[PDB]
Amino acid sequence: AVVMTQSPSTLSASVGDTITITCRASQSIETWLAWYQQKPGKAPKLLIYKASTLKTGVPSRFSGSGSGTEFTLTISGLQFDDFATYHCQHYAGYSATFGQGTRVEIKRTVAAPSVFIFPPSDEQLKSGTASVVCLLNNFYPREAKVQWKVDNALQSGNSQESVTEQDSKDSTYSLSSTLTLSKADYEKHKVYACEVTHQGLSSPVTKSFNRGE
Amino acid sequence: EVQLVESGGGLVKAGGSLILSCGVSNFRISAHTMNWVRRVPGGGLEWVASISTSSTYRDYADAVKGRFTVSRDDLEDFVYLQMHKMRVEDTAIYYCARKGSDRLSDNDPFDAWGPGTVVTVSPASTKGPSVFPLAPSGTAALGCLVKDYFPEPVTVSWNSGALTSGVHTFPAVLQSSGLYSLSSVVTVPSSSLGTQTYICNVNHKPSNTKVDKKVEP
Numbered sequence A: 001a002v003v004m005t006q007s008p009s010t011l012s013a014s015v016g017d018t019i020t021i022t023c024r025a026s027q028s029i030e031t032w033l034a035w036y037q038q039k040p041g042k043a044p045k046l047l048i049y050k051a052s053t054l055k056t057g058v059p060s061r062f063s064g065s066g067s068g069t070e071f072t073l074t075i076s077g078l079q080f081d082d083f084a085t086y087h088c089q090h091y092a093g094y095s096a097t098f099g100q101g102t103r104v105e106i107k108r109t110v111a112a113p114s115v116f117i118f119p120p121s122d123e124q125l126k127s128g129t130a131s132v133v134c135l136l137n138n139f140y141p142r143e144a145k146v147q148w149k150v151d152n153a154l155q156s157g158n159s160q161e162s163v164t165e166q167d168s169k170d171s172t173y174s175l176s177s178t179l180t181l182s183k184a185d186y187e188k189h190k191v192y193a194c195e196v197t198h199q200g201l202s203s204p205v206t207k208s209f210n211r212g213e
Numbered sequence B: 001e002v003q004l005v006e007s008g009g010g011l012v013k014a015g016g017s018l019i020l021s022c023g024v025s026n027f028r029i030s031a032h033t034m035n036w037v038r039r040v041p042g043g044g045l046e047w048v049a050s051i052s053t054s055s056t057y058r059d060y061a062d063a064v065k066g067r068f069t070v071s072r073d074d075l076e077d078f079v080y081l082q083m084h085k086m087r088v089e090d091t092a093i094y095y096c097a098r099k100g101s102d103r104l105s106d107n108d109p110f111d112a113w114g115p116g117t118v119v120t121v122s123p124a125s126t127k128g129p130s131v132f133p134l135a136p137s138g139t140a141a142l143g144c145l146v147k148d149y150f151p152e153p154v155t156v157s158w159n160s161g162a163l164t165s166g167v168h169t170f171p172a173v174l175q176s177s178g179l180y181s182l183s184s185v186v187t188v189p190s191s192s193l194g195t196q197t198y199i200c201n202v203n204h205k206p207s208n209t210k211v212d213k214k215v216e217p
């Protein structure tokens, strides 16, 4: 089956730059290739099809080239509206297949996360649940890892995370991780710790507290 | 040997949508008008929808007309029921039923029935969040945890909008309970803490709910 390999996975650039994104097919696909733009929480938008034909309304700064197995999308003079994910697709008579997408983001210097941990409030704890919150503030690039440890036990399967879009003033990301336990489980351990890893840190950073002061 | 099996079915909030399907064994549906019927908690049956051969005619009970759609797939032998803008009184066991059998005349009873799938519609279309402070302790962080509301969205300002710098309000996360949760945080000079009061203003329009929580060390 055709496999599409899209490079790079993330592309960091400044406004005004000309950038290229590529897609290689595992086997010849003539020019049966489309490029889509996608912003978070929105539908994909078709930009280019048959490798190089622009859809009506698409700005002329977008262009596509290639045939056979190698394809390129070029944006000549990036604008703020263009920071988004781009997807290539081989489309065939019955099926289709996508590359893994390329996230185009605004470039800035590496920033390690500033890390903060928050205990559950007594009020919430009285209701039978403990939410422990870890904040990773103002970091770049977007990849980070949070691990929770309770009394030094690596936890699994009991946290959820969310991440902001790049900050409009400083182009950083922030991330929140929440560890959720029952009051019974919460009150059986003392040390709660959020442990963070990011390329901007030379070692993991841990923030903790002892349950109840 | 002939059988029908409903799938989909579960818990729905009032106002929500849910789609059911019905697969069959040991007969083909093409020659039959297919039907959905439900049994309400008081015990009676209510005819819901009918779809005739080749989808020539689709008919609905008055109570569901305009909110429900029945479709059929003769090549793979399925029947569908879309239910939209659901109401408490849609709560019922839903069955698909075949009209006619090997005995196939111009008007037959419901000769074969599936075992039913349970659909429950909860009366609250919405629910306001609980807000919990995210208590602080160069620069300090604090924030508000906005828990267990539905549906999206919730809005968080700070000190009634005066404070905007250093604020991050995260995307809501859907909890395995079916309720949304988000956090909003802000970093402030840590020297400002034993002075300056911080209040998150949490607004949830769907439930007409406004909560102001003072976050302090």
Ligand SMILES: OC[C@@]1(O)OC[C@@H](O)[C@@H](O)[C@@H]1O
Binding pocket: B031, B032, B033, B034, B052, B053, B099, B100, B101, B103, B104, B105, B106, B107, B108
């Ligand atoms: O609904 C009318 C009818 O003629 O449609 C085809 C078969 O379902 C018959 O059993 C049924 O009586």
